[PDB]
Amino acid sequence: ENKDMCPICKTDRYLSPDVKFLVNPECYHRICESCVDRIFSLGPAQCPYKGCDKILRKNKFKTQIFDDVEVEKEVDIRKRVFNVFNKTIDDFNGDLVEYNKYLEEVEDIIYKLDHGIDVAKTEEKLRTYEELNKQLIM
Amino acid sequence: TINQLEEDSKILVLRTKKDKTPRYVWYNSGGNLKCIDEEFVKMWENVQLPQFAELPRKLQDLGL
């Protein structure tokens, strides 16, 4: 929103809002251009976005069309889950129920990764994503 | 009573402490609002202005 776009310059619209407002994927915080240029030039620390402690990393930012914080994170989580599993047991033989059961397991693991669960099945899915990455190398 | 009726309730005239504030009759609407620091006052007075139609033309370069 216009009332919150930067922890230092939240309402720069009266002072001509000519810069963008980057959002870090490990922070999900509205950080403007001018303040963040001082940030990653002097080391990778955390942002003080309402007293945040998540360490911001240098570069690897993104422009957003504002899908809140959930659907902005769920779109990259579904895109990261669609590349590791790829089209395994889906259209390899014109399968339908076996393709739907394999896509329901990919959707429920993505729903478990989106909700966070309790970092147990997600850590098991992190091993399964490591299993989906090791099976794509052999 | 002027000191207790601050913020545009008794805009007097603090002439001098030796004059014991030779008061006057005035009242604004907000009056006080003294949270402006004096560092903000000096920077408000250190600005020179391009007069006439220059500052409207520079406002279009600035945004207004």
Partner: protein
């Protein structure tokens, strides 16, 4: 960076050296005064290529002194550092504000404020090293440095590097 460029210079010769073999005397002053030096416009001078096809051109005499003026075109390799340049090297001298790293012929200091915060100065050790959370930076260790800025003074080129960002520090 190590670059090759055809350059030129003017030589002043003493009149006693005015014999038929003075072209060798021209080659005498060329090697000892150009190679192994530095210039602010070209960098640290390295080696001169082509010892045979060297432009001797002609020779003019200045009105005073009786000496002779020339202009000799050639081909040589120089080393010119730049900004934003990622290099390597080895530490030689250290400090309580960082250390200096020898990069070929040029020694570049890195400030402590251009280092990560977990990197800590070890003072009581001999030599006084720099210990972080995983590495101990001493003298003979090899450290991959990105050059930030440079000083382009004539015949005395200096620079400033850092190892704060990612894929940096020791090699």
């Amino acid at each position: 960076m190590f670059f090759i460029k055809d350059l030129s210079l003017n030589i002043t010769l003493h009149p006693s050296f005015f014999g038929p073999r003075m072209k060798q005397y021209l080659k005498t002053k060329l090697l000892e005064e150009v190679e192994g030096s530095c210039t602010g416009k070209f960098g640290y001078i390295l080696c001169v290529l082509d010892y045979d096809n060297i432009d001797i051109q002609r020779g003019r005499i200045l009105p005073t002194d009786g000496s002779a003026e020339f202009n000799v075109k050639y081909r040589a390799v120089v080393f010119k550092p730049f900004k934003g340049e990622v290099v390597d090297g080895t530490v030689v001298s250290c400090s309580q504000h960082g250390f200096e790293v020898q990069v070929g012929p040029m020694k570049v200091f890195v400030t402590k404020h251009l280092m990560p915060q977990d990197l800590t100065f070890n003072a009581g050790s001999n030599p006084p090293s720099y210990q972080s959370s995983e590495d101990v930076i001493t003298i003979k260790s090899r450290i991959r440095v990105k050059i930030e800025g440079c000083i382009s003074q004539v015949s005395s080129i200096h620079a400033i590097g850092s190892i704060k960002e990612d894929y940096l520090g020791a090699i």
